[PDB]
């Protein structure tokens, strides 16, 4: 098309055409915009495109064209600057400086082309980073002088200085070498006195809001690093906290400066510096009260109105007040005359804390936690804040977010429904609120009870009744469990439960009953101490929970199950013993009525119920009694199981129907549930079903294969085959669950393992990829983890069955078979950790695949895989090293040392594996340290490839210099040699070593990096 013309550099650049393409991209749409975008990207990425920059700057009538022109220069400046001849550098500098001057002089442009001037200034800063001060010593003085001569230029100088401070102090860590960063920070430090002098003068002269605002913006940056004396030994605190607070244009930025000042490094023993720290706060709070709003103002309302910049201002006020008070409030606590100020500051925070804005609330809550935690320990402080704390109790109680346990919510129709999902993001908020509220309760338990009991009274009588009001209250009441005395709690919980029971009678309809039910369940589950002490109450609660297991409201039902297990986890002892005036332990009563009790529950709820019973049963430590309870608990599933192990043993095809497959799955799921809570105690039940279970695993496996053969791979998607695989998966989960908690490892090895391996391994190996269950690998990891040391031949067998066939599934790309990928490297890790001999038994060809597999893991972006890959590599090296000077260790190094070194370097330097840096560096340090310490007994080089007797150290350096030279040909030999010298000398100090690697990663991105940077220390 016509637009492609600009890509032909053999002809002169048509600036008009460039402007057309640019405005087509920025102001057009559809296919024309898409085409223009590609053209511009290609234009920009053309390595000679920068030579067109001056031409574009001079002759273009489009600001975006000139912007793109500057991006092209920026890329040149930051990457290839030292490649240029010296006159081109002078030239580029001159027309950048000249353009800035020119655009500042012309008022019209200065006003309307702010994007372009800011971009021009950043580009200037890039030149400074390369050239300043060494080849430009007069930049700052000439900048300072030029300021006096024009208000537009002075203002823009402040922008340039802001950006320079940013680039040097705030964003240099990743982008420069340690040595260059130090150089530029020192350079700014040495000339700062003059920079500040101009800054102070402008602030004092106080002419032009936009110049003042720009000056304060630069100051905000300077405050990240400048010495405190510039702030405390000049009049600058007075100006910030009075003058600049009064004007709204300068108020935003001044508050942020004052927040940063509150963080400066400051002597703790100087009475005067303390007085100055008090005064600026006092000034600032006075200007807010007189110029912005009084302490009584409704900040909730103001924020919600969202006029102008009010929300951002209130946000910044919160940040200032919380930052200052966290550090300095002690300065205000002892002087009687400073008390009004202390409390006014906190009263503003109380008002800020009422704003409806989650993230702001978190900021304030962080502060309250800091306060109350301090009042909990610091002697004689809490009385000061008694009125503040009392108001805080109200704010927190009235803004309690729904706890994870409460499973009901309100929908748009005004109906109380079960939630669709978990409110994942309010979990942390609840914890924080609870923490503060617990502290406040300890600080004044009388005040808290009174507030809650009377709030509750106003729910009953109806004066303040609402779902919102009863919920927040109920959540708050549950959240302070543990704060009161057992006796106060006794009376408290009694009163609260009486009231909530009264509330349930009063408020009818499914919605009101769901709300009140949820709240009572949350409270009772939160006070197990009370439940332990009050059996009749406990029993009645549990029976009440069982009634809810029959509710048609599914939310209430599900919470009944969760509350049941929550109670049981804490109170199980009281279910297992026979209570006074009861004919039997309540566990006996529960098991007996289990069919009736669980009859309306969904299966996963039935499994939770069973899991709870398992918790109780494991309280019984007499083995005879425990096993009997286990057997009684499992009666229904064992009976269903027994009848299926006959029917399906008669008709291997009867597994065809959905209903039987669902039944079987639920039977095994029930076993998993009970095994989860009983752990080692589950064994006898595992023994009842084990062999038939493994036979079932084989039968189901045959069915899956039969179906895939008859229907194709698509069969694996069908409900039928998915149901059969579910059975195999649950069987594997059950065995995993048991072995992971087993205490008798001898029985695991002598009874469980051989039949397990027989049932699962060949089946995995001989199914097509799409039919292999990644869960097999997961089960095997637990087997190796727990008994691998006892089953060396079994480990060999596991490897043989899964290693090559899984590797071939996952080594074509990074995405196919994600679960297998993850479980595969988990299994290799534990085998390498626990049964390294298994790898020694592999033939050389398969061992090579192992090494391939490890390095393949290095190259994953997926963290699960990547991390294990690095760990395996490190553990492997340690395993070899442990063998000492024997032929396998020798051949290992000869074959694979340099493969690991080069592969580790590749992921270190490719810019796509940055999350792995720490472990990559550790691995590389280990590898280099092996040679540096002469822990490799044989030469790493071929005979005659280098002179005889040549040390491995000398050869390593030679190999690496060659490797880097070819991998990074734009580096000089001196850069490489210096890098390697440092890196190799620093191979005992991970912190310094990592620094040197990071410096290398900076230098590979540019040309002409200084090799002396690697001497940094």
């Amino acid at each position: 098309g016509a637009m492609e013309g600009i890509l032909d550099f053999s002809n002169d650049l048509d600036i008009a055409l460039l402007d057309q393409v640019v405005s087509t991209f920025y102001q057009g749409s559809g296919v024309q915009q898409k085409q223009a975008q590609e053209i511009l990207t290609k234009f920009q990425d053309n390595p000679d495109a920068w030579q067109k920059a001056d031409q574009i700057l001079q002759f273009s009538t489009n600001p975006q064209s000139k912007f793109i022109a500057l991006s092209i220069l920026d890329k040149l400046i930051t990457r290839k600057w030292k490649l240029l001849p010296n006159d081109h550098r002078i030239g580029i500098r001159n027309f950048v400086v000249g353009m800035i001057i020119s655009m500042c002089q012309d008022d019209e442009v200065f006003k309307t082309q702010k994007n372009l001037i800011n971009k021009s200034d950043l580009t200037l800063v890039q030149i400074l980073k390369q050239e300043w001060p060494q080849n430009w010593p007069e930049f700052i003085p000439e900048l300072i002088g030029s300021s006096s001569s024009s208000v537009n230029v002075c203002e823009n100088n402040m922008i340039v200085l802001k950006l320079l401070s940013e680039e040097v102090f705030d964003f240099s860590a990743e982008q420069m070498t340690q040595a260059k960063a130090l150089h530029l920070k020192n350079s700014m430090s040495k000339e700062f006195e003059q920079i500040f002098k101009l800054c102070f003068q402008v602030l004092e002269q106080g002419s032009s809001s936009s110049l003042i605002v720009a000056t304060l913006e630069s100051l905000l940056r300077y405050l990240h690093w400048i010495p405190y004396r510039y702030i405390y030994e000049t009049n600058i605190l007075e100006l910030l906290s009075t003058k600049f607070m009064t004007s709204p244009d300068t108020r935003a930025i001044t508050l942020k400066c004052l927040t940063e000042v509150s963080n400066l490094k400051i002597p703790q023993d100087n009475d005067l510096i303390k007085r100055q720290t008090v005064l600026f706060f006092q000034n600032t709070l006075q200007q807010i009260a007189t110029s912005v709003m009084p302490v009584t103002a409704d900040l909730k309302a103001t924020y919600a109105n969202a006029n102008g910049n009010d929300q951002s201002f209130l946000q910044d006020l919160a940040m200032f007040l919380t930052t200052y008070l966290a550090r300095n409030r002690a300065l205000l606590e002892s002087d009687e005359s400073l008390r009004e100020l202390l409390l006014n500051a906190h009263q503003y925070l109380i008002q800020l804390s009422k704003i409806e804005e989650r993230e702001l609330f978190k900021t304030t809550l962080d502060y309250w936690h800091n306060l109350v935690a301090d009042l909990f320990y610091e002697p004689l402080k809490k009385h000061i804040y008694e009125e503040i704390c009392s108001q805080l109790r109200l704010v927190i109680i009235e803004n309690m977010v729904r706890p994870e346990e409460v499973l009901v919510v309100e929908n748009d129709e005004g109906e109380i429904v079960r939630e669709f999902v978990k409110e994942s993001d309010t979990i942390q908020l609840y914890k924080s609120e609870r923490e503060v509220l617990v502290y406040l309760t300890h600080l004044n338990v009388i005040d808290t009870e009174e507030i809650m009991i009377s709030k509750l009274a106003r729910q009953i009588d109806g004066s303040e009744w609402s779902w919102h009001n009863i919920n927040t209250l109920s959540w708050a009441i549950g959240s302070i469990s543990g704060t009161m005395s057992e006796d106060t709690e006794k009376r408290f919980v009694v009163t609260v439960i009486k009231d909530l029971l009264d509330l349930c009678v009063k408020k009818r309809g499914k919605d009101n009953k769901a709300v009140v039910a949820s709240d009572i369940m949350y409270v009772v589950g939160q006070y197990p101490r009370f439940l332990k002490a009050h059996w009749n109450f406990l029993r009645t609660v549990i029976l009440a929970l069982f009634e809810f297991m029959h509710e048609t409201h599914e939310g209430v039902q599900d919470m009944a199950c969760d509350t049941f297990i929550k109670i049981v986890q804490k109170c199980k002892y009281h279910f297992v013993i026979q209570q006074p005036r009861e004919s039997e332990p309540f566990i006996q009563t529960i098991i007996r009525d289990i069919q009736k009790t669980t009859a309306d529950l969904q299966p996963q709820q039935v499994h939770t119920f069973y899991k709870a019973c398992g918790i109780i049963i494991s309280e019984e430590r007499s083995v005879a009694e425990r096993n009997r309870l286990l057997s009684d608990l499992m009666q229904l599933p064992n009976m269903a199981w027994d009848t299926i192990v006959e029917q399906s043993t008669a008709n291997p095809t009867l597994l065809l129907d959905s209903e039987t497959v669902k039944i079987i799955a639920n039977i095994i799921k029930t076993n998993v549930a009970v095994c989860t809570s009983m752990g080692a105690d589950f064994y006898p039940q595992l023994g009842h079903i084990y062999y038939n279970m493994l036979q079932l695993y084989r039968a189901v496996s045959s069915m899956i294969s039969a179906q895939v053969a008859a229907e194709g791979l698509i069969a694996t998607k069908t409900p039928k085959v998915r149901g059969l695989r579910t059975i195999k998966k649950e069987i594997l989960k059950l065995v995993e669950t048991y072995i992971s908690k087993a205490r008798n490892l001898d029985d695991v090895v002598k009874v469980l393992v051989e039949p397990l391996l027989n049932a699962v391994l060949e089946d995995y190996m001989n199914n097509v990829p799409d039919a292999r269950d990644a869960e097999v690998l997961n089960c095997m990891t637990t087997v190796v983890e727990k008994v691998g040391h006892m089953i060396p031949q079994g480990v060999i067998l596991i490897l043989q069955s899964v290693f090559e066939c899984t590797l071939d599934m996952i080594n074509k790309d990074f995405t196919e078979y994600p679960e297998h990928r993850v479980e595969f490297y988990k299994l290799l890790k534990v085998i390498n950790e626990k049964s390294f001999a298994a790898f020694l038994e592999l033939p050389p060809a398969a061992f090579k695949l192992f090494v391939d597999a490890i390095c393949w893991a290095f190259k994953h972006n997926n963290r699960d895989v990547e991390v294990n890959g690095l760990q395996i590599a490190l553990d492997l090296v340690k395993n070899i090293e442990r063998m000492g000077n024997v032929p396998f260790a020798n051949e290992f190094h000869k074959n694979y040392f340099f493969i690991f070194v080069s592969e580790t370097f590749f992921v270190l330097t490719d810019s796509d594996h940055k999350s792995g840096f720490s472990k990559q560096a550790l691995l590389l340090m280990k590898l280099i340290s092996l040679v540096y310490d002469n822990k490799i007994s044989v030469p790493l080089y071929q005979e005659a490839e280098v002179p005889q007797g040549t040390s491995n150290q000398v050869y390593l350096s030679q190999y690496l210099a060659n490797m880097l030279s070819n991998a990074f040909p734009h580096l000089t030999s001196e850069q490489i040699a210096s890098f390697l010298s440092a890196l190799t000398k620093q191979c005992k100090d991970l912190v310094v070593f990592k620094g040197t690697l990071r410096d290398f990663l900076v230098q590979i991105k540019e040309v002409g990096g200084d090799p002396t940077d690697y001497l940094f220390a």
Partner: protein, 200 residues
């Protein structure tokens, strides 16, 4: 038509394109095809104050596909900065994206979004996410996969841009609808629906 330029930035693989596609068509794209430079998509929402149109500039997060980079931000009226709560490096880089963005766009409403909260093994803890406070950015936990808070960034931005805190999304009106194939249906029947183990 009232339309606003929204630029969307963040590290490669954080879920920018997937988030936008979800809003555009309703789909969840499982594959990672890196964006090359920028993709521009119109995206309309119906509100109680009329239709608001975002022209979404979904930019490339991978450095090698960055294209014009900050050149994309010119004249943006709002922004979303995206990171991945399962990847800490992506949160570490938020200040860098914010820096490059506000240098070109000095006073615009910006939402910070932590994506992929559907994933069990979360790495960037809730408690750690504080960068937004001093920079006045709105923050949300989101998931483009589970649709957790997926609408919140646009609801907030629309409130800020229209200047009405009480703005709500409203149901678009439903026009009465009007009144070989056998090959096409059979291929559809025999292609399995994805994610058969989800709730819906």
């Amino acid at each position: 038509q009232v339309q606003f330029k929204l630029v969307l930035v963040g590290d490669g693989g954080t879920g920018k394109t997937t988030f936008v596609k979800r809003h555009l068509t309703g789909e969840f794209e499982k594959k990672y095809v890196a964006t090359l430079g920028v993709e521009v998509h119109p995206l309309v929402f119906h509100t109680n104050r009329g239709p608001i149109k975002f022209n979404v500039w979904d930019t490339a997060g991978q450095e090698k596909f960055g294209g014009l980079r900050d050149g994309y931000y010119i004249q943006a009226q709002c922004a979303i900065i995206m990171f991945d709560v399962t990847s800490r490096v992506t949160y570490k880089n938020v200040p860098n994206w914010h820096r490059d963005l506000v240098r070109v766009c000095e006073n615009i409403p910006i939402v910070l979004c932590g994506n992929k909260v559907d994933i069990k093994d979360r790495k960037v803890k809730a408690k750690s996410i504080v960068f937004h406070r001093k920079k006045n950015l709105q923050y949300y936990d989101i998931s483009a996969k589970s649709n957790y808070n997926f609408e919140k960034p646009f609801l907030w931005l629309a409130r800020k841009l229209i200047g009405d805190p009480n703005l709500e999304f409203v149901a678009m009106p439903a026009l009465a609808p009007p009144e070989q194939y056998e090959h096409d249906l059979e291929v559809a029947q025999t292609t399995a629906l994805p994610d058969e183990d989800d709730d819906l």
